[PDB]
Amino acid sequence: CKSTNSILDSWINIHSQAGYIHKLMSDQTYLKLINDRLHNENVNTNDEDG
């Protein structure tokens, strides 16, 4: 029973992280920001502060 519980808490952790990052991927603004961040790093990787 204890081992089953441990497996289930591992599943719980996985699904919690899945939900958080799904919330992240839900917002279009953050994805746009990381997209032009990728393009900026393509043109200039130095300006991380930008």
Partner: protein
């Protein structure tokens, strides 16, 4: 108080019987002690840590594995049925 030899044999047999009687009573109790890690012990004795406190702990989250798949499939079927009845009733 002198006694017949048969009576004395009955008596000390009764004594031994009482001895393993309270021995078995102590054993059954020790099984029933929920004193797991409360008294000096490191073995689990059948108690809520084997029952609802534990099995229910499992159960409040096992539904997230088994019954939730069904529930999702049933919800899709229910939505499909809703769409079908709406279209059928409104089209005619």
């Amino acid at each position: 108080h002198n006694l017949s030899p048969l009576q004395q044999e009955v008596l000390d047999k009764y004594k031994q019987l009482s001895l393993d009687l309270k021995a078995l009573d102590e054993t059954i109790k020790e099984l029933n002690y929920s004193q797991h890690r409360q008294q000096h012990s490191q073995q689990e004795t059948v108690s809520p840590d084997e029952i609802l406190q534990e099995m229910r702990d499992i159960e409040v989250k096992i539904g997230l594995v088994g019954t939730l798949l069904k529930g999702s499939v049933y919800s899709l079927i229910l939505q499909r049925k809703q769409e079908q009845e709406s279209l059928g009733s409104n089209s005619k």
